[model samples]
Target: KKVGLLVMAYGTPYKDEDIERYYTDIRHGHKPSEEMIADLRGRYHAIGGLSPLAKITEAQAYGLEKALNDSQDEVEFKAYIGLKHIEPFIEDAVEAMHKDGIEEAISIVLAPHYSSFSVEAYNKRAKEAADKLGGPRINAINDWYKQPKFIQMWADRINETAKQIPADELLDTVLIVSAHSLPEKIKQHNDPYPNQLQETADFIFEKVVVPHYALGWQSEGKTGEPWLGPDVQDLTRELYGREKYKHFIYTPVGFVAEHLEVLYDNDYECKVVTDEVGAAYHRPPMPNSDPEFLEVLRTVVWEKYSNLE
Candidate 1:
């Protein structure tokens, strides 16, 4: 049987022109209003007119394939990157794999943690593609939130940031970790996301020494109904006012791949929010195809494949 590793992400626009198409596709058949188009285009254009996710996931696929097969002589492992909302979509990837004679495959979304609405949604789309092609063997890897290597990667960052601030101000600097927001109803519906995210946060806080930290939601929907909260920006302002934290460092634990939300949302959007509050804000960089990070992902993928075999 031919085994393959299919890496996946939410996908990104290739360039400035692809922004409109990307935005529209995200809305799923409805055309975006002119104002919405301008807003999205502005977000993409603000961050150099393209998203690094596709390219990063491509690199991940390359790294994971090599890492898994480097020492082995038993069977050659193949890797592919699939994006949910863009070119080489999960469907496209599935079609290509079917065409290429992929008898069995391992699928992993680049994001960490899992929830009914989020991780499952990504799996649903990929599964649809698999069904269309007569259901080839594909093992999906989900829920590596508490994986030791994954936790170490995040915990190390928190500690590293803690060490960066001056000894005097270090006690007051707040270390904040955040993730993508889902609707409040998801919480009411007992979605596992906030719990898993908090679990990750708890792991980091236990591993790193910090005086205080707050978990707040960001990048919420403009859809009238409330998304997760208290908004990270609101919490930033509140903490600045109340605790008077002298310095701040943001850990976007919610995101792994480099996308518009990560670049424009946290880096530029929320970065300014804290800057105005008279706090020294620092947003540490993500792993972004870092070798250690990819190795952890490789392990997640390989374990899933091996268990099934």
Candidate 2:
């Protein structure tokens, strides 16, 4: 048997020139204002001209494909990357699979938790593309935040990084597990994104020993609508003042890899506040292409693969 593993992710531009078009694609072809373009470009500049997400995402696809192929002889799995907002887009990947003679493709977005706006949109795009090609069936694994290994990976990361703080300081430390914020209106639609994030945090909490914890939101849009909060920056200041926290463990359960969110937003932007308030800040390394994390991806793909007709 032959299977196609279409690993999808929110794509990043590799060059400054591409950022505008990338943002335009994200806006569904509606070009962004010059100010919006410059703002996003400046963010890219702050993070070293470009993000490693393109590289990390490729490694994930390559690693996952190798893992799937090695684990079983009954089926041959080939992985391809489909970016939601860049060249060789989701549709292109679906077409590539069909051209490669794959009749069945299993798709998993790199994101673990799902918002109807996120994973659902990825799945829909892949399916529509496959439909256009008239072959290469798309089977999507929409959510894996609760997968045991997924939870284990986070617990291990937290425990490993939390060791940086001395035992005494750990007593005053607070762990803020954060994710990117969507519109608070998502609440009106009863979106599961926030709850799913909390559930993942809850699962990791049971496995790790932490003195205090709070769920935080990051990368909120400046759109006039109210986005989710308490924002991580605000929470950091509040915790330092009112809660009197001396050290902080910042692990974004919402993100699996290092991108603008983790690098520019949390590391640089958030840490500035942590430093000003006289508190130590620590973050667990993201699980980019770690073998353990790849194994988790393999397990998730196999679970969906087994359920198919």
Candidate 3:
């Protein structure tokens, strides 16, 4: 048996010149205002002039493929990476798999939690591509956020990162769990995005105790509309005043890999608020190409792939 493990992610621009084109693709080919473009470029510049998502996502595909191949002999698993808004897109990956004579495959977006606006969008493209290509039996996996291995991995990391705060100031510490903010309108349709965040946060908290914790939405677009809230930076300032919290640990469980949002938005933007308030800020390391995380991905694939038989 041969299986193609199609891994998909939100894309990033590798070059300074590709920034505008990348952003335009993100906006569905609508050109962004020059000010909007400049602002995004500045964020990328702040985070070392590029997003690590593309590289890290490729490493994840390689890692997961190796894990799958190492453990099983009956099936040969080949990994292919796809991105939402750049080169080597979801459709291209699907076409590649079809061309490689893969008759059955499992597809997963790098995002753990599912939102129609996010994971569904990626899966839709993959499904469309598979249909147009007429083969490769794409089995898209959704909602692996509650996987035991995944939750356990996060709990372990949170417990370890929280210990960084001095025991004396531990009582004043607060954990701000976060994810990318989507449009507030998703609530009307009863989208599972917000609930997914809550469930994942609850599961991690059940295994690891923090002084206090609250969900804070991060990286909302400037779409001149309400996105989820309270924003992480705003939430930090509010907690600092209302609860007199002096230490913060940021855990963005919604994202599995380190990217622009994690590096710039949470690390840099949120840290500024903590510094201004004289509070300590700490962000737990992201699960980028980590061996344990690869195991989690492997398990998710196996669970779904086996169901095909």
Candidate 4:
């Protein structure tokens, strides 16, 4: 049977001028009022008015494709990247897979962990696309957060960051693990996000040999909407005010690649807040094109494909 892979992510704009265009698509072509536009513009501007998500997702696709090709498996595997809210969407990817004669496929959301609000949404969209195409053999690789290789890749990055900081300074550092926050209602409904995130965080903490660590939530939605908290910024401020920490290391454990949340919120916005509060802030490098990460991707894809055969 013909087999394929579809990697999905939240899309990004390519250039500064395209920021509005990207936002327009995100807002579903709804014209934003002047006040709304200003609010969004400021958020984008804080992150330099553009995110590298598109480029990063492309690189991830290339890595997974190369890994699969190198495996020389009996199944013919062709991989494509699908963005949930932008170019090369789920529908487009599904259509292309059908055109390429792929009968069985695996859809992998780049984010290793899952939340009903995030990964579940991706799975739903993929299923809807496949349904529109009259159905195809599609299985989503959901909840790979605890995959051994995936956890190790994160541990490697976290340890690498630790190596750069002075040994003496390490004890003074507070390792803050942050993830894109979902609405609190999801947790109320017994969503597995909190537990999954905790597991990922605990694994990294144990493997990285970091004694000081905490988890925080970020990229919350509108003000009235209750999202997972205490917010990262507020948490940072609270930590600083207490003077309980001297240095900060941010581990964006939820996302697999560099996106607006990492580039703008953690690096720019959070860094500013940490600096103002007399704390040194450092972020673990995002897993974009990291060799260890690619290996994990390869392993996960291969395992899934092998199971099908």
Candidate 5:
């Protein structure tokens, strides 16, 4: 039997000009005035005019593919990436799958957590594609935010990062687990994103035995509308004012791989804030190619299929 797996992601800008194009798309193609465009241009400029989401998603697709192939089971497996709003869109992936005669499929969003704005959008798109192609045996993995192995992978990374810092510093260090923040309106609609993030943080803290950890929301949009808080910047300020903490370790736990948000906001922007406030800043490495993370993906896929059979 032939099986196809579709890994879906939120796409990113390919170039500086594409950054404006991205916001335009997100705004649903409503033409904004020059003042509005200029404001958005500055935001993207602050972060280097490109989001690393696409590249990271590509790495995830490759990692998942290799993991599935190495199982060496008779079940023939093929993997494809379907971006929700950019290149390699879900429609294109579904068309390819149909052409390849894929009779069964499993769709997984790169996000570990579920939210109406994130995972739900991917599920809706995948279902639309499947329906467009006359339907197939489709299985969607909604949330694995609390999976034991997944939690352990994060715990291990935290432990490894702690090894690099002095023991004396560890006690005084503040471990901040930052995730992408969505609008507060999501809460009103019963979205579980905030809770899922808390669960991931709680699991990692329990597993790693770290007592100085806190959760902060980051990479928020510039919309005048409210979003989840306290923002990372405010949290850093509050910590610096405390005077007792001298170091900070950031874990972008909401994201599994390195992306513009991690490189720019966490590393550059947040690091600058820490330096200005006389605090040392360090970041736990992203689980880009971690063996355990790959194993978790394989297990997730296997469990999804085995349940159906």
Candidate 6:
């Protein structure tokens, strides 16, 4: 008579000192040195010494459950927040759902796009927990970028951001849509990341017409491997110096909430890059737990569940 819902995300540290432990978990148990620890600490310090990811994710789960239960009296909808690299992990959340006697459930990762390298992994973790628990059947809500509300949310932001651009710069201002970069190997594996990101960008552009836009990759790992090309920072300079485009609006489609990647990488690092090249840059505020975003989450869950046999 009831269904379980679990929301999963890439977790963040609970506190300042937890950064090292958190980073270690991200590195899959490889202990970071003082240099590595301090680098992460410095980034956290730049952004007020914490990541709001964990808290915002928790609120999302809470809000989703409230909305679902408020509308459905016959069937109960319970939600839980699980993190990939931190506490209340994916496996733990699935286990809890099974124990709670939910025979079938839905889990949605916050990331909008899907790829074998990304959403598939989240699916694996949830399914592993489901199989181990031997009770609940877990289904993942995947690839909601095409959903009407999802497009509207960004279109709303882009429409608002369009107003803030200087009229004189309108001809020159170019949109730099971006997301976290993945290794080129994903391309070899025929990953859907690039195409999905482009589709999301195109959908927003269709709703709110801009002069120009292009996809850029951000937050690439320092592993010396070739990550996605035309990195955001490099693209910023190329557009500025070569093409004479001096104004930019960056909206990260990949990330759902503001965190270290959004705060430091986009704000501090990208800001520095733009400053050095004498280009003006602006980013719309992230749609973190916005009522509309939450509504989309609620709708997506029910839509996916309705199709399930």
Q: lDDT for each of the candidates? A: 0.80, 0.88, 0.90, 0.81, 0.80, 0.85
Deviating ranges (above 4 Å) for candidate 4: 15-18, 28-30
* Model 1 residue pairs with clashes: 179-254
Candidate 1: tens digits of C-alpha lDDT, residues 1-309: 557777788888776777777778878867799899898888878988777887787888888888888856667788877877788887888888888988788888777879776679878887888987886677888788777898888778777877888899987888777888887888887888898888888888887777777787778876778888877788888888888888877887878866778788778877787779777877776878898888888778767766886
Provide TM-scores for the models. Answer: 0.95, 0.97, 0.98, 0.93, 0.91, 0.96
Whose TM-score is higher: candidate 4's or candidate 5's?
A: 4
What is the descending TM-score order?
A: 3, 2, 6, 1, 4, 5
Give lDDT for model 2. Answer: 0.88
Candidate 2 on 146-250: residue-level lDDT in tens?
Answer: 899999999998888777678877788888989889889988988999999889888888887777888999998757899989999999999888878888888
Worst lDDT 10-window in candidate 5: 43-52
For 1-309, candidate 6 gives per-residue lDDT tens digits of 788888888889998878888888887799988998998899899899888988788888888888778866756888877778888888888888877788988889889999786788889988887887796888888788888998899889987888777778778878888888988889887788999999988888888756888899998875778998788888888888877877788899899888899988889888898899888878888878888888888889878877885
Q: For model 2, what is the error of residue 218's alpha carbon versus the real structure, in angstroms, after optimal superposition? A: 0.9
Total clashing residue pairs per candidate? Answer: 1, 0, 0, 0, 0, 0
Ranked by lDDT from best down, the candidates are 3, 2, 6, 4, 5, 1
Top model number, lDDT: 3
Error of 5 at 170 (Å): 1.6
Among residues 3 or more apart in sequence or in different chains, the pairs in candidate 6 whose N, CA or C atoms overlap within 3 Å are: none
Task: Please report, as a residue range, the 10-residue window in candidate 3 with the lowest summed lDDT.
Answer: 161-170
lDDT of 5: 0.80
Q: Which stretches of candidate 5 lie over 4 Å from their true place?
A: 31-52
TM-score of 2: 0.97
Colliding pairs, model 5: none
